[PDB]
C-alpha cells in the first residue's frame, strides 16, 4: 500500500536536468497538473537543471509543494517507463 | 483543433482484447479515471475481449460514458506511444 508506494517514489525520483523539453511537455500533457506556476518550476528543475533551492526561490514555492509535484511527475515517469516496451 | 482531435481518436481507437492486464493497468494508472465500475468495464473490453454491449450492460454505462472513456484511454495510448522513444537506448 501507501508506505511501499512512497518508497518506490524515493527510489525512482526524477532528478534535476533529467529530461528534454518535449519529453517534459508530454508528461505534463498526460498529467492532471494544470498550474502554470508549478509547470514552469518543474521545467526549470527537470529540463533546465536548476537546483531545487533556486527553483523554489524563483517561484516562491515551499518544499511540500515542490516535493509533492515532483512525486506526481516521478509516478507518471515510472508508469510511462513501464509502458514503453509495449510501444518500442 | 477539437475537430481534428476527434478524427485522430477514430483512427487510433483501441480494440477489444488488445492488451495485457499489466499494460491496461498502467494506462489506467496514468489516467484520471476514478470510477471502479468504469475501470472494470474497460478491463473487460480491452483485456478480456467482452463486447461494448456486454460491458455497458454489466456495469450500467450509457453509450456516451463508454465512448468517452474509451476515447480517454485512446488519447493516453497515443501520447504514451509518442513518449516511448525517450525511454530507449539512443
Residues B14/B41, Cβ–Cβ less than 8 Å: no
Nearest to B80 by CA among B17, B23, B7: B23
Enter the C-alpha cell of residue B30: 496514468
Contact residues, chain B, for A76 at CB < 8 Å: 30
| Cα separation, A76 vs B61, whole angstroms | 28
Cα A25–Cα B76–Cα A80 angle in degrees, nearest 5? 65
The dihedral formed by the CA atoms of A79, A82, A83 and A88, expressed in degrees to the nearest 10: 140
What DSSP string describes A6-65? HHHHHHT---TT-S-HHHHHHHHHHS----HHHHHHHHHHHTT---HHHHHHHTT--HHH
Collect all residues from B whose CB is shorter than 8 A from any CB in A: 19, 22-23, 26-27, 29-30, 32, 76, 79-88
Question: What is the Cα–Cα distance from A12 to B22, expressed in whole angstroms?
Answer: 19
CATH code for the domain in which residue B39 is found: 1.10.10.2690
Task: Read off φ and ψ for residue B13, nearest 5 degrees.
Answer: -55, 135
Please name the method used to determine this structure: X-ray
Task: Give CA–CA dist A13/A35, Å, rounded.
Answer: 21
Residue A50 in grid coordinates: 536548476
Nearest-CA neighbor of A67 among A3, A7, A11, A14?
A: A14
What is the grid cell recorded at A39? 509547470
* Beta carbons within 8 Å of B4's beta carbon, 6+ residues apart: none
Instruction: Please give, rounded to a whole number of angstroms, the shortest distance from the CA of B88 to a CA of chain A.
Output: 8
Closest CA to A67 of A52, A80, A54: A52
Q: Which residue of A has its CA nearest to B81?
A: A87
C-alpha cell at B90: 539512443
For chain B, how many structural domains are there in total? 1
As a whole number of angstroms, the distance between CA A81 and CA B87 comes to: 6
Resolution in A: 1.4
* Binary contact (A83, B23; C-beta < 8 A): yes
> Residue A85 belongs to what domain range?
1-88
Contact B45, B16 (CB under 8 A): yes
Cα separation, B71 vs B2, whole angstroms: 13
Give the Cα-Cα-Cα angle B74, A74, A13 (nearest 5 degrees).
155
d(CA A39, CA A44): 9
Of B67, B13, B61, nearest to B36 by C-alpha is B61
B26 vs A20, A26, A83: nearest CB: A83
Measured between alpha carbons, how far is A87 from A79 in angstroms, rounded to an integer?
Answer: 13
Amino acid at each position: 500500500g501507501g508506505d511501499a508506494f512512497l518508497l518506490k517514489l524515493r527510489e525512482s525520483a526524477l532528478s534535476s536536468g533529467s529530461m528534454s523539453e518535449e519529453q517534459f511537455f508530454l508528461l505534463i500533457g498526460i498529467s492532471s497538473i494544470h498550474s502554470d506556476r508549478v509547470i514552469l518550476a518543474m521545467k526549470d528543475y527537470l529540463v533546465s537543471g536548476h537546483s531545487r533551492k533556486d527553483v523554489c526561490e524563483k517561484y516562491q514555492m515551499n518544499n511540500g509543494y515542490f516535493s509533492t509535484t515532483l512525486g506526481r511527475l516521478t509516478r507518471l515517469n515510472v508508469l510511462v517507463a513501464r509502458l514503453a516496451p509495449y510501444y518500442t
